[PDB]
Amino acid sequence: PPVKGRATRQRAAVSAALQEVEEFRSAQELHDMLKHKGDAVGLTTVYRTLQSLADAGEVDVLRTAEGESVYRRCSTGDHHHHLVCRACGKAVEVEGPAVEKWAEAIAAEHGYVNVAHTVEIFGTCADCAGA
DNA sequence: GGCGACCCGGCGCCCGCTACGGAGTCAACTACGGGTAGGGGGTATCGGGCAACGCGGCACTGAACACCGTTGTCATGTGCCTTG
Length: 131
Ligand SMILES: [Zn+2]
Ligand SMILES: [Zn+2]
Ligand SMILES: [Zn+2]
What we know:
alpha+beta; binds zinc ion; Zinc uptake regulation protein; 1 chains; transcription; DNA-binding; zinc ion binding; DNA-binding transcription repressor activity; three-stranded mixed sheet
């Protein structure tokens, strides 16, 4: 996980933590689990590295209803949409050219120069209903 | 043949401190052979110089709620006037 800044142990540690975690997480709870591992990193520094990862683009970023920004990394480079369960957090990556063509067609119809789509589908889990 | 002088060796010492001069010297040679040590040449290893980047207080982000404060508001109750 290369970063724009000079490599060191702490960015490697947070990158490895993101690698192990395959769920949507917030910065504060990410720091909580990171401290639980025992690295004892700083809050604001963790912010810098996660922000850098979001800027780099190798980690997707989502915004919750509460307004918190949450992050998680994706195995595949190409763009995709993550279906996520609020209770579980199971993020599954899917993509469809139909929505892309729809966006381009709308942009052309309205004479828009450039666009950027943000589509996230929320829903109820299959196993959450079961008990 | 122990005494005896005597003889000889052999040794022992020979007041105190400061303060006060220098001086320094006569008779082989070569060949080899190694080994250490020096020199430079090149090389792995340690040490010195810079911005992010760890942190933390608080600060802003006010956003999003909460805490009283307020004049919105309502359907529903007294007091006077008209008619039983
Ligand atoms: Zn993604
Ligand atoms: Zn998409
Ligand atoms: Zn679920």
